[PDB]
Amino acid sequence: MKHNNVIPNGHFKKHWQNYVRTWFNQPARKTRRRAARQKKAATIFPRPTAGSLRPIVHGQTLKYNMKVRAGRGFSLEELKAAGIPKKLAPTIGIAVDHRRRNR
Amino acid sequence: PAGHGLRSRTRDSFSRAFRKKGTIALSTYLRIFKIGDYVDIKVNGAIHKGMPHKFYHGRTGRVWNVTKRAVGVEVNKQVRNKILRKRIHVRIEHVQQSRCTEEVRERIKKNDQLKADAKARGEVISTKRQPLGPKPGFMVEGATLETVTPIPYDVVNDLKGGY
Amino acid sequence: VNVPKTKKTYCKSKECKKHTLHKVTQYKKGKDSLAAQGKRRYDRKQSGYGGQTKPVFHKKAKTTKKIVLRLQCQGCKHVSQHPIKRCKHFEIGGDKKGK
Amino acid sequence: GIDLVAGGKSKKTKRTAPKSDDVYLKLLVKLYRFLARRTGSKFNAVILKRLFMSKINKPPLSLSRLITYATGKGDNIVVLVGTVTDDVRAYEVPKIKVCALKFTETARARIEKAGGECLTFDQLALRAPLGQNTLLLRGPKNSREAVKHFGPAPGVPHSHTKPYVRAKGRKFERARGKRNSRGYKA
Amino acid sequence: NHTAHNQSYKAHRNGIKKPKSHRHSSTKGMDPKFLRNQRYARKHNK
RNA sequence: GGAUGCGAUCAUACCAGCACUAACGCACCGGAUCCCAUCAGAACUCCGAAGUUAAGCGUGCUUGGGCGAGAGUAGUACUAGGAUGGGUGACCCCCUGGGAAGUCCUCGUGUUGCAUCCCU
RNA sequence: AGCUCAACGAGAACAGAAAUCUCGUGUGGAACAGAAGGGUAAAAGCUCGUUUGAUUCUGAUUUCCAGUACGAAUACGAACCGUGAAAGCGUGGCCUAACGAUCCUUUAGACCUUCGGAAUUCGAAGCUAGAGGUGUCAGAAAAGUUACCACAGGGAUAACUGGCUUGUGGCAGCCAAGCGUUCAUAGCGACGUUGCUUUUUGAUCCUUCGAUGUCGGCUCUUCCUAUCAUUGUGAAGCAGAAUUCACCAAGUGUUGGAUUGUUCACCCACCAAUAGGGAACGUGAGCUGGGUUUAGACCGUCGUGAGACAGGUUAGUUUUACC
RNA sequence: AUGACUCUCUUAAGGUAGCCAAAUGCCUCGUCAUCUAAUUAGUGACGCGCAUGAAUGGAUUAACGAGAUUCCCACUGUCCC
RNA sequence: GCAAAUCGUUCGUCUGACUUGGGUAUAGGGGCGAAAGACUAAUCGAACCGUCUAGUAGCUGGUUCCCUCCGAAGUUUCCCUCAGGAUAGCUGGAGCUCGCGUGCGAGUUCUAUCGGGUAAAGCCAAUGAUUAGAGGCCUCGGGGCCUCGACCUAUUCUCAAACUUUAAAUAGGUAGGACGGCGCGGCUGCUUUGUUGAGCCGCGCCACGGAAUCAAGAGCUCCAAGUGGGCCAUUUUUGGUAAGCAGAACUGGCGAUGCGGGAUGAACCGGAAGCCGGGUUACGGUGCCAAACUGCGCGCUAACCUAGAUCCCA
RNA sequence: CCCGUCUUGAAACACGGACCAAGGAGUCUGACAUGUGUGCGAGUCAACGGGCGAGUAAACCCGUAAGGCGUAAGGAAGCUGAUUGGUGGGAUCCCCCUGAGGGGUGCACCGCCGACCGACCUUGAUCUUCUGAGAAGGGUUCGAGUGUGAGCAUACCUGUCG
Ligand SMILES: [K+]
Ligand SMILES: [K+]
Ligand SMILES: [K+]
Ligand SMILES: [K+]
Ligand SMILES: [K+]
Ligand SMILES: [K+]
Ligand SMILES: [K+]
Ligand SMILES: [K+]
Ligand SMILES: [K+]
Ligand SMILES: [K+]
Ligand SMILES: [K+]
Ligand SMILES: [K+]
Ligand SMILES: [K+]
Ligand SMILES: [K+]
Ligand SMILES: [K+]
Ligand SMILES: [K+]
Ligand SMILES: [K+]
Ligand SMILES: [K+]
Ligand SMILES: [K+]
Ligand SMILES: [K+]
Ligand SMILES: [K+]
Ligand SMILES: [K+]
Ligand SMILES: [K+]
Ligand SMILES: [K+]
Ligand SMILES: [Mg+2]
Ligand SMILES: [Mg+2]
Ligand SMILES: [Mg+2]
Ligand SMILES: [Mg+2]
Ligand SMILES: [Mg+2]
Ligand SMILES: [Mg+2]
Ligand SMILES: [Mg+2]
Ligand SMILES: [Mg+2]
Ligand SMILES: [Mg+2]
Ligand SMILES: [Mg+2]
Ligand SMILES: [Mg+2]
Ligand SMILES: [Mg+2]
Ligand SMILES: [Mg+2]
Ligand SMILES: [Mg+2]
Ligand SMILES: [Mg+2]
Ligand SMILES: [Mg+2]
Ligand SMILES: [Mg+2]
Ligand SMILES: [Mg+2]
Ligand SMILES: [Mg+2]
Ligand SMILES: [Mg+2]
Ligand SMILES: [Mg+2]
Ligand SMILES: [Mg+2]
Ligand SMILES: [Mg+2]
Ligand SMILES: [Mg+2]
Ligand SMILES: [Mg+2]
Ligand SMILES: [Mg+2]
Ligand SMILES: [Mg+2]
Ligand SMILES: [Mg+2]
Ligand SMILES: [Mg+2]
Ligand SMILES: [Mg+2]
Ligand SMILES: [Mg+2]
Ligand SMILES: [Mg+2]
Ligand SMILES: [Mg+2]
Ligand SMILES: [Mg+2]
Ligand SMILES: [Mg+2]
Ligand SMILES: [Mg+2]
Ligand SMILES: [Mg+2]
Ligand SMILES: [Mg+2]
Ligand SMILES: [Mg+2]
Ligand SMILES: [Mg+2]
Ligand SMILES: [Mg+2]
Ligand SMILES: [Mg+2]
Ligand SMILES: [Mg+2]
Ligand SMILES: [Mg+2]
Ligand SMILES: [Mg+2]
Ligand SMILES: [Mg+2]
Ligand SMILES: [Mg+2]
Ligand SMILES: [Mg+2]
Ligand SMILES: [Mg+2]
Ligand SMILES: [Mg+2]
Ligand SMILES: [Mg+2]
Ligand SMILES: [Mg+2]
Ligand SMILES: [Mg+2]
Ligand SMILES: [Mg+2]
Ligand SMILES: [Mg+2]
Ligand SMILES: [Mg+2]
Ligand SMILES: [Mg+2]
Ligand SMILES: [Mg+2]
Ligand SMILES: [Mg+2]
Ligand SMILES: [Mg+2]
Ligand SMILES: [Mg+2]
Ligand SMILES: [Mg+2]
Ligand SMILES: [Mg+2]
Ligand SMILES: [Mg+2]
Ligand SMILES: [Mg+2]
Ligand SMILES: [Mg+2]
Ligand SMILES: [Mg+2]
Ligand SMILES: [Mg+2]
Ligand SMILES: [Mg+2]
Ligand SMILES: [Mg+2]
Ligand SMILES: [Mg+2]
Ligand SMILES: [Mg+2]
Ligand SMILES: [Mg+2]
Ligand SMILES: [Mg+2]
Ligand SMILES: [Mg+2]
Ligand SMILES: [Mg+2]
Ligand SMILES: [Mg+2]
Ligand SMILES: [Mg+2]
Ligand SMILES: [Mg+2]
Ligand SMILES: [Mg+2]
Ligand SMILES: [Mg+2]
Ligand SMILES: [Mg+2]
Ligand SMILES: [Mg+2]
Ligand SMILES: [Zn+2]
């Protein structure tokens, strides 16, 4: 150790060379996932390729409460207000989340 | 520290002069010190407070601060390849007003008037001093000449007062 | 070394901020608590196998300690600490020289 | 033998040409090699030297700082061997003639909107071959992170040099040596 | 153990370097009472 | 020309012995109620003005000691640089430069600021 | 604030060299905690009065020095005090040494901050300043032995030869007090003083630790002279005989044995004589292996012990030439 | 000359019976005797024994030993050579 | 080597704690041991095999093309630090800011001024050490009025790294203008009895550069290598009889460097260097070796000891 | 005089080297740093992934409150959060004058001294929900701050570390 440099903290004291994850298959993974989506679209035709309808939910914590995003599924209270029985909703492309509350 | 105390090797440097001990004359305390004045550091052995390190004894510096009982002095100190401007405070008992620049102020005035007198007459001159140059030729009146010759050697005289 | 029982010194309390009478007593280190975080960590580190997990000083060299005077202000009833130089014999309120 | 140092040769190094391979910069260098030689203008000599300099020796000049230095000098042409950036902190942009190696997209739009003109150094030679009525400006050279780490070491007295630390917080160089309660403060 | 041999030669390779002298010197370490009044004098200077 | 008060320089101003001094001073000097002070009114302190220039202070003197200055010691001792200088060595000459100190000898024995007062 | 010390001189019942008291001289010849140096006399010393600046808050500077820390010291600023009539002095000791990081613990201080769902009270955790210590003193927590030994290296470093040196060892000269019955010098040379030698032992650590085989004897050659015998001579306190001193001189010779591993030594005997040395302390691919100096084993002393012993003892592989 | 005896310091106890310059003694090639022409060897004695000693066994001991040592006779190329 | 333990002769024991085959049991910090740390497959004071493993090494060895330019250090501080590391110094690269003689720089001197306690000197000055007489012989002791020594006065021989009144040479510090000076005003909470000071500010005016010499220029910053074993010499100098010994001071030199001279030699003398021609020299030389006189002059020496023959130097 | 090597010192009686061919040693990667080249610039970065596409491991396109770094610091924390420059030198340019000249201009950089934000300390008219607000006025204290941004991505050498 010599000169004025930041104090090194390299975490390379284990057998790290046995746990290196390369990404040479990254182009192949893109190809495989695209093929899976293309195959899935034909299976569910004419159902939309985007999948089930997801609800609008707020971001968590003070840092993200100003934005909205897709949630898991519509709450039971929301489905009842919309007049859609919960057992029928998943069969017509509506995601159902029995855990979500409505505050 | 590290093998030498603050006043090590000061047996002679910090001792008072012969038959010049005891009360310090009060002209020392009546001196006026201003910023920019030059002072010579001379440690007085009787005053143990505000005394400079032995290195600064016998050095001349420039006054950069004035306090109730001491003056701040700037002293050059050579450390390896650099000169450091050491700023130290010293009680006025250890400092004497230096006469290193006594000729400067009077010289400037003489140069200014000489140039002023020459300017009015349109004669360009130089007020620079010059070192001693070669002497001109001259005649010396003849006088009685005393002849100097080598002295014959005598062993008995090879001792102060002779043998 | 002999120190007087009472001493008139400066008081830092905002009430006084002045010289007041103080009572002189010797400071004594308190008992080590088992709940102190450092003690809690040490006991955890010492548990199980591995033996002594921390250094144990052995090479004692000092023959004295820096005695600390505990000065309790009589006005504000607050305490201040004043260490003194090393000494082997120390007392508070001992008979003064000559008397 | 001769009592000299390094055989009387210079041991100083200065840039006699740009390090860049930019073909346009080399054309500008050729243009201002001719101007400096055939005119003896001090302005041309300074411009030629600054064209050789590295990126950090050609710092950008903010538009706001350009406006302040150009106040009361509308007639003069501002010359900068470097890049002119836009400054959102400046609201009123007066019409000004500015010559620079490069203008950012926002800076060019603001200057052109205000009736000003953005010039290159080849256009400047046509309008001011000797640099007549020019305002020569330089950006802040020492306003960058690296310079904060230069000078006396952080641990020496009377030092405000920024140390090299991988993170900022109570656990990163705040202990012994940075306060009296831990050994000393430095 | 110790010797000063060659040390003066090393010092004179690039030295002796005198410190750069500026017209105005730092006021740090001067009498605070004098400095504080000087700051007030400049504040009301006109 | 001096004294006195405060001084500056801190022996050319000190030390010893001897001699001398107008005027105003400065002293010695009288006393112990009060302030103050001790074993002790010796000192310190307070009050005073009979006596005396005896001392102190001042000045002068000494083939005096010391101190100060000069001369001399001496271009000696020592010393910077130089030599394919001498010499077995120890040491030393020469070349380009710098350069002391006791003894002995002669001379000197303060100078001076501010204020007040005497000579007036 | 007042006072002046060491010492000496001259005086006073018991009282003297030395008790106490008086006068005089007294540049410090005393004293100032300790080492030494410096410093100090209406004081820094001595005796009394009043006291706690040995206080609180930062920063700056010096010494150390990387111009880092610590210790120590200095000059100011802003407070609160002491002392004196007052100026003034006081931030420990007249000055130059007398001391200590991180983590942890403990104490002091701030109607202070946090315990992260919101509160209260305990508890705990922080902020600021000290204390408990690292003397290897910039600060690991630390007993031996190895002759059963291992590895990395080191000729940066010991144990041979050689080299420098020659104190020591050995050999030699000069001066002449004296010895020699008489008589300094036939033969001697006290007190001093000048040298030589590397056949003693030390001093050093320059060469060799990816090795120059480490005692002595045996065998064998050559060399030196500071000559033991032999040849030729000078001197004598040389009658003869024998002996002694000195000169040219290294041609020839200098032995057989007891005891000891020895070198060294000592004795017996012979002889013209039984002189002294060098050659890597000549000589181990020449020998020998008694000794020393691996591993087995015994004794004595030492050590709790493993083991140790320039102490004794007994047994212990000596390789290769044809370049 | 020596020290039965006495005095004195002192230990848990002060080495007793024996034995010894011993495979244990520094000084040391100890002293005396013996063996030899001559012995730092051997043997027998002596003992204030650096530092001997009683199952850490002491002192002896017939017989035995590819154990260490000295001498004498025989024998011899070990040697004179 | 027949042999990684054999061969020859010579030796121990030989009815017993005897010798030996096969079977079988004990396996690595374990076994087994009539005990040698012996033996456990030529391996034993902890077997063998694979793996962890390319174990770590401040230590040894090696570390691959060419020219060109610059060019060191063996010193500081800290470190269980002394064969190491970090740190500063020395060095390279990268530049940047300026400058062209009006330079504000200098391992130099001059002028003015300041500090010093070594060399020498001093004792006939303090302190310490030390030799001898002389006078006075008052007063003390000594012995036998005498008498020696103590005492006093004036002299005298010889001395000091840890004594000194005095006191060099060499070396050390500071200063010699434009960052100067003067005049008139202003500011202040600091300072004064006091617009008295102190410092600063504004305006106006003056300032031939204010000693010599040189200036192949000056300043500033960044990143980083190597080094942190030194050695030699003149002189000063400590320990040591001394040392090609050990340890310091100033400078140079070697190391990193050839070249000429010293026969030969890291350091002595000369002198430092691109590849060449000519000229001339330094030190050293001119009888031969061997380039240049047996050159021109004076004297001394005669060696029957190997006469003598060139700084360091033998 | 034999090369290489350690060394104050090697032709060495210091070590390696009988000879030849071929093989044979500062690399790759992560982090950071200075320097330089390039792009853009108060921003910058297509990086996970998606849309596609040389019938295609490339190239091309996509950042909608994504994220990283930067754009604001100080404090242990509760918290608070930059009133926005003066001066001495100085490049360039302009005018007068033709001097080592005088005015105007004053970037970069350096020196010096204020102000502003924050920790600490200090201060408090006037208000308030009693603990807050803040008229004025501060400090030899402390900060890797402010006073009209300079960063981000990327390439490579060198250096420290794993
Ligand atoms: K993969
Ligand atoms: K010492
Ligand atoms: K444990
Ligand atoms: K007093
Ligand atoms: K008296
Ligand atoms: K240590
Ligand atoms: K000798
Ligand atoms: K060896
Ligand atoms: K042989
Ligand atoms: K045997
Ligand atoms: K046997
Ligand atoms: K048999
Ligand atoms: K094992
Ligand atoms: K090492
Ligand atoms: K003298
Ligand atoms: K004397
Ligand atoms: K280093
Ligand atoms: K090597
Ligand atoms: K070697
Ligand atoms: K070799
Ligand atoms: K770096
Ligand atoms: K962003
Ligand atoms: K996107
Ligand atoms: K805080
Ligand atoms: Mg690993
Ligand atoms: Mg989601
Ligand atoms: Mg230290
Ligand atoms: Mg030192
Ligand atoms: Mg547990
Ligand atoms: Mg347990
Ligand atoms: Mg040349
Ligand atoms: Mg060069
Ligand atoms: Mg702590
Ligand atoms: Mg500091
Ligand atoms: Mg009276
Ligand atoms: Mg009278
Ligand atoms: Mg006289
Ligand atoms: Mg003393
Ligand atoms: Mg102090
Ligand atoms: Mg009072
Ligand atoms: Mg103190
Ligand atoms: Mg005292
Ligand atoms: Mg003090
Ligand atoms: Mg502590
Ligand atoms: Mg704590
Ligand atoms: Mg919680
Ligand atoms: Mg240490
Ligand atoms: Mg062990
Ligand atoms: Mg050696
Ligand atoms: Mg001798
Ligand atoms: Mg003799
Ligand atoms: Mg060898
Ligand atoms: Mg061999
Ligand atoms: Mg051999
Ligand atoms: Mg002879
Ligand atoms: Mg006869
Ligand atoms: Mg012979
Ligand atoms: Mg020999
Ligand atoms: Mg031999
Ligand atoms: Mg041989
Ligand atoms: Mg052999
Ligand atoms: Mg042999
Ligand atoms: Mg043997
Ligand atoms: Mg053995
Ligand atoms: Mg025992
Ligand atoms: Mg044996
Ligand atoms: Mg017995
Ligand atoms: Mg015995
Ligand atoms: Mg015998
Ligand atoms: Mg026999
Ligand atoms: Mg016997
Ligand atoms: Mg016993
Ligand atoms: Mg028993
Ligand atoms: Mg026994
Ligand atoms: Mg027996
Ligand atoms: Mg028997
Ligand atoms: Mg048997
Ligand atoms: Mg056969
Ligand atoms: Mg088992
Ligand atoms: Mg068996
Ligand atoms: Mg064994
Ligand atoms: Mg294996
Ligand atoms: Mg490897
Ligand atoms: Mg340590
Ligand atoms: Mg090495
Ligand atoms: Mg470095
Ligand atoms: Mg002088
Ligand atoms: Mg001295
Ligand atoms: Mg002296
Ligand atoms: Mg002398
Ligand atoms: Mg090394
Ligand atoms: Mg060293
Ligand atoms: Mg050596
Ligand atoms: Mg080297
Ligand atoms: Mg020669
Ligand atoms: Mg030529
Ligand atoms: Mg001739
Ligand atoms: Mg060597
Ligand atoms: Mg070599
Ligand atoms: Mg050799
Ligand atoms: Mg080797
Ligand atoms: Mg070989
Ligand atoms: Mg190859
Ligand atoms: Mg970059
Ligand atoms: Mg975002
Ligand atoms: Mg706050
Ligand atoms: Mg503030
Ligand atoms: Zn109080």
Please provide the DSSP assignment of A64-89 as one string.
HTT-EEE-S-B-HHHHHHTT--TTTG
Q: Which of D59, D38, D40, D36 is nearest to D48 (CA)?
A: D36
Beta-carbon contacts of A73 under 8 Å, excluding residues fewer than 6 positions away, are A52, A54, A55, A94, A95, A96, A97, A100
Protein CB footprint (7 Å) on chain I nucleotides: 53, 69-71, 73-78, 85-97, 105-107, 110-118, 164-166, 172-177, 179-181, 186-191, 198-201, 206-212, 216-225, 230-232, 247-253, 271-273
Residue with tokens 């201002």: D32
- Phi then psi for D33, rounded to 5 degrees? -65, -45
Neighbours of C64 (CB within 10 A): 11
DSSP-assigned letters across all residues of D19-57: S---HHHHHHHHHHHHHHHHH--HHHHHHHHHHH--STT
Beta-carbon contacts of E25 under 8 Å, excluding residues fewer than 6 positions away, are B64
DSSP-assigned letters across all residues of B16-46: PPTT--SSPPGGGTT----TT-EEEE---TT
B83 touches chain E (CB under 8 A): yes
Q: What SS3 state is found at B140?
A: coil
- Which runs of consecutive H residues, i.e. helices, occur in chain E? 7-14, 32-43
Chains B and A touch (3+ CB pairs under 8 A): no
Give the integer Cα–Cα distance in Å for B90 and B41: 9
Name the strands in the sheet holding C68-73, side by side, starting at the edge strand that comes first in the sequence.
C6-10, C19-26, C68-73, C79-83
Q: At what angle do helices D105-113 and D63-70 cross, to 10 degrees?
A: 40
Calculate the alpha carbon distances from C19 to C9, C26, C80, C84, D62 in Å. 5, 21, 13, 20, 61
Beta-carbon contacts of E1 under 8 Å, excluding residues fewer than 6 positions away, are none
By CB neighbour count within 10 A (0-12 exposed, 13-18 middle, 19+ buried), where does D97 fall? buried
The first and second tokens of residue C69, run together, are 């005077």
Distance, CA of A42 to C1' of F103, in Å: 135
Q: What SS3 state is found at D148?
A: helix
Residue C79 amino acid letter:
V
Distance, CA of D104 to C1' of J61, in Å: 25
Chains E and A touch (3+ CB pairs under 8 A): no
Give the integer Cα–Cα distance in Å for C70 and C59: 30
Residue D24 near residue D18, CB atoms below 8 Å: no
The first and second tokens of residue C5, run together, are 């029982």
Give the integer Cα–Cα distance in Å for B149 and C16: 98
Residue B61 near residue B39, CB atoms below 8 Å: yes
- Contact yes or no for D166 and A7 at CB 8 A: yes
Residue D98 near residue D111, CB atoms below 8 Å: yes
Q: Please list, residue by residue across A49-88, b when 16 or more beta carbons sit within 10 angstroms of its beta carbon and e when fewer do.
A: eeebebbeeeeeeeeeeeeeeeeebbbbebbeeeeeeeee
B67 touches chain E (CB under 8 A): yes
Give the integer Cα–Cα distance in Å for A28 and D178: 53
Give the integer Cα–Cα distance in Å for D141 and A40: 60
Q: Which residues have their alpha-adjacent CB atom under 5 A from ion ligand 108?
A: C 11, 13, 16, 20, 73, 75-76
Q: Who among E12, E13, E17 is closest to B83 (CB)?
A: E17
Give the integer Cα–Cα distance in Å for D33 and D30: 5
G62 nearest neighbour residue (CA to C1')? B88
Strand residues in C12-90 grouped as ranges (E): 19-26, 68-73, 79-83
Residue B21 near residue B46, CB atoms below 8 Å: yes
* Chain E contact set for B66 (CB, 8 A): 31
Residue D97 near residue D116, CB atoms below 8 Å: yes
* Bridge partners for B78 per DSSP: B83
Residue C94 near residue C2, CB atoms below 8 Å: yes
Q: At what angle do helices D42-52 and D23-39 cross, to 10 degrees?
A: 150
